Amino acid sequence: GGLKKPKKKYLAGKPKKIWNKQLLLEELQLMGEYGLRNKKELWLARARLKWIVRRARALLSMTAEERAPLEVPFKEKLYKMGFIEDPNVPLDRILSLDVRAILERRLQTLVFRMGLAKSIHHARQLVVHGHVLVAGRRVTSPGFLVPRELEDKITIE
Amino acid sequence: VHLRKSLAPYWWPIPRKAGGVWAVRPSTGPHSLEYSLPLAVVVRDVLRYAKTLREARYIISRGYIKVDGVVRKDYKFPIGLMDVVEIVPTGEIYRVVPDEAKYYDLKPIPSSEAALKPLRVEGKTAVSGGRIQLHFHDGRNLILPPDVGRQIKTFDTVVYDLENKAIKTHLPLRLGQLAVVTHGGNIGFVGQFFEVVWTLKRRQSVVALRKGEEVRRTILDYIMVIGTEAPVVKIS
Amino acid sequence: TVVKLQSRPKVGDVVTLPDGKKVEVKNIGVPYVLPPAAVCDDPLCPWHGHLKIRLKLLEVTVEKVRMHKAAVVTHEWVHYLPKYNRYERRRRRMRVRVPECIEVKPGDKVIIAETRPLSKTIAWVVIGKKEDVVEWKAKHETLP
Amino acid sequence: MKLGAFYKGGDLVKPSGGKKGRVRKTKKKALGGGPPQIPKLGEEDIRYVERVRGGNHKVRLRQARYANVYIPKERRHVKAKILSIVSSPSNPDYARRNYIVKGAIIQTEVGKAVVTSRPGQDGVINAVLI
RNA sequence: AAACCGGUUGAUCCUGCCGGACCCGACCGCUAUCGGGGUAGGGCUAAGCCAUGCGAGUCGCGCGCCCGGGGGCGCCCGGGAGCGGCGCACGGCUCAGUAACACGUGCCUAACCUAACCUCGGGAGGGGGACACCCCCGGGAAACUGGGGUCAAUCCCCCAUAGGGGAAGGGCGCUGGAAGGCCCCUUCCCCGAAAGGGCUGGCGGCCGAUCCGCCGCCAGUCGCCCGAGGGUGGGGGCACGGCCCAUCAGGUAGUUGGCGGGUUAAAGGCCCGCCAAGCCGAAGACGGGUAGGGGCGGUGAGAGCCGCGAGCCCCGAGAUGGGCACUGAGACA
């Protein structure tokens, strides 16, 4: 009798106790460093990180034979996205990943880190107003997670 | 009668979500509804000649498409296993052969082969005058004299001449012949019939085919003999 | 109506009752159940009549033999409960047709075959007792 | 026919003797039956062809005078005349009201005969001499 | 993130309940700029009552007639009111009834029907009739509807043959796990087909501008009838699976079974005549309560709990309540 409807994807990143002073301080630090719009963006990044880490945990829990046809492609995809720098690291090192690696892949973050903008908020304004070209096309979403191959194809108008 | 897209057969080469809520329902013809594809679906989604149902129905109504030697002007005509499809203005000839990936695919075949159909015998009946009616896998019938009907058994194959309405050749179900799986899971596999477990019901007997070292198992109902070590008609 | 035999006949032979009616022991299509040691004239019998059975058999135990040409048999199986990871032995009483040539008693283990419906509650018929079962194996042929 | 007055559908009673609710409020036309159509002993044969389910036809003997009596001791078929009904073992009311049913005993001109046909379903009285 | 926090004491360790923090669904308050994706919206409330409009047609290549333009061969084009065929039993809605062979899974019908479509084999001969639109008259407020005249059919009917059914006897043979089935032979009884119609082109003949047809043959093509199988839909049967209550313990009497029949497309206490006492129940009958079943959905680390088991798909039931029929392959619509 149940009809499926979409659910929020940042729930896995959102904490259940928001009123911790330490958690609030670290989240505020991350938000101010990367110029995020609200806590939903940070929790979405944490949800992405949680997916990656739980995939690593699941592949670790599978046997060697089952893990064999999935371990190498998994690390290859993480390397291609840019979350992991060495695609041949052991699987258990993937368990220790950090949300800052995912936050670095934002288009606004990359525009700031390439020196194309005066500040991270100015990079967000550039991406919003449409002056950032990704391989010729305007990508107007500041939260876009740029891959490694597309990282070098970022231009300004 | 309507065919909801959800109730359409799962092997049909159509999207399951993107599109309308309806699918073209085959019109009770010479196959099974769940093991056949309508002619409009073949023209629009299999050959991509028509972009809409209107264009497909126009193409069919002109008589450009021929199925098993007969022009078919009905857009809901069922198309099924081993059927010969012929396009008139282009001259292209396909056979609907079992496929590993699409489960049923139109593979081009030679013009000399286009007049033959390998039909699996599905049963025999006694009819008036003492004659024998063979019933084949696609519902086709052939009335024969009793002496020729006596030696043809169920699950045999016959290569049948569409143009002559005759039995070009008879391939009996024996161990060691080449057979193709025409149904479930292990579909499209061609191999040597090398092992049988004869259950009490003959149709549910366990059959094993071999392709070198590739051993697959099915039931006896799900295989069709296509000759000895070389298949008689081009199926791949 | 029923005649007994000093020895069990086979599938196929004809025996004439004292009435002079000849009954041919029919092949019911089950090769691993022997025909009974008696022959009846019942046209609803599967061994000596026109009754046709399907290929669905069941092992049951007889509970009550007091209806005419019928009995109450019990059907037992085991059901798995996932939440407790444990089993439960279930049972269900069934009404079946017992032919005249097959005499049964409470506690007996018999075999029932599904047929067309015969009464309001009867759609299975006693094909034979458990002692009438013979061993049967499929045909196993391979190409070297 | 298919009449709701002669419904042949399921009961509302369980085998345990208790009642059960009605799963369907209306009576299906497919489950309907018809009234008896067995012939009455009369002065001439009257037959009526009736349309039935699926467009088929059933011949009904609304009145029967002659019977196809078979003598196996002569291996011969004779079209005899029914003087009367001697008995209806299925129900004596049939013979009492002069109705002919299967298994009925009829005194035809060849003698006593058992009706071996369903006269309400076959439309003819095939009989066997005794 | 497999999490704890506050509260009973003068203080202390327990028990144990209540609250906090999270997600989802309904309604509600304050506030609200844009875009994309999605099968959201009188379900959770009365299956309560309804103004108004729309919501199943299509076919001139089945048929005659009438009207208008064109042209000479045998008609061309357009329109009208109809007869006739096919469809309207699909599709759309909703959740009262239902604790049930309803639903799900796995099997059956050797106990059955099926227009349309497919294939194989065979057949299409003789004859007859009526009713619309229409014309002349109406009647009635309207709904609806009467009489006379008159042209047709793929409209309706008879005849013949083919074929079909019942009873009985026999058989190599077929299917199939197994014949109460199929085929063959024999006997009687009974029922009993068809539209060679439309179009195209060709040929020939009859006929006349008051005609623009009719007839005989050929080919193509769409059609019609019988037999067999398939396909599709449907009817029916079986095993098992999924609610609460004992402050509900005995229930059942066509009830349980047998035998012989009627009815049905077909098995069956489906119904009927006779015969017996059987059938269900503490492994929970019967009684009451609640509820459409499933795919599925929410939540939790998980076991699990819940149904927001409304929307989307499949099956079921219903059309103000309760009944009963016509037509038809199929409805009790």
Ligand SMILES: [Mg+2]
């Ligand atoms: Mg019943």
Ligand SMILES: [Mg+2]
């Ligand atoms: Mg205190």
Ligand SMILES: [Mg+2]
């Ligand atoms: Mg409502």
Ligand SMILES: [Mg+2]
């Ligand atoms: Mg036409």
Ligand SMILES: [Mg+2]
């Ligand atoms: Mg008109």
Ligand SMILES: [Mg+2]
């Ligand atoms: Mg419907």
Ligand SMILES: [Mg+2]
């Ligand atoms: Mg007609």
Ligand SMILES: [Mg+2]
């Ligand atoms: Mg016959």
Ligand SMILES: [Mg+2]
């Ligand atoms: Mg006639």
Ligand SMILES: [Mg+2]
């Ligand atoms: Mg005529």
Ligand SMILES: [Mg+2]
């Ligand atoms: Mg009966």
Ligand SMILES: [Mg+2]
């Ligand atoms: Mg009853």
Ligand SMILES: [Mg+2]
């Ligand atoms: Mg917990």
Ligand SMILES: [Mg+2]
């Ligand atoms: Mg809705």
Ligand SMILES: [Mg+2]
């Ligand atoms: Mg009513």
Ligand SMILES: [Mg+2]
């Ligand atoms: Mg109505």
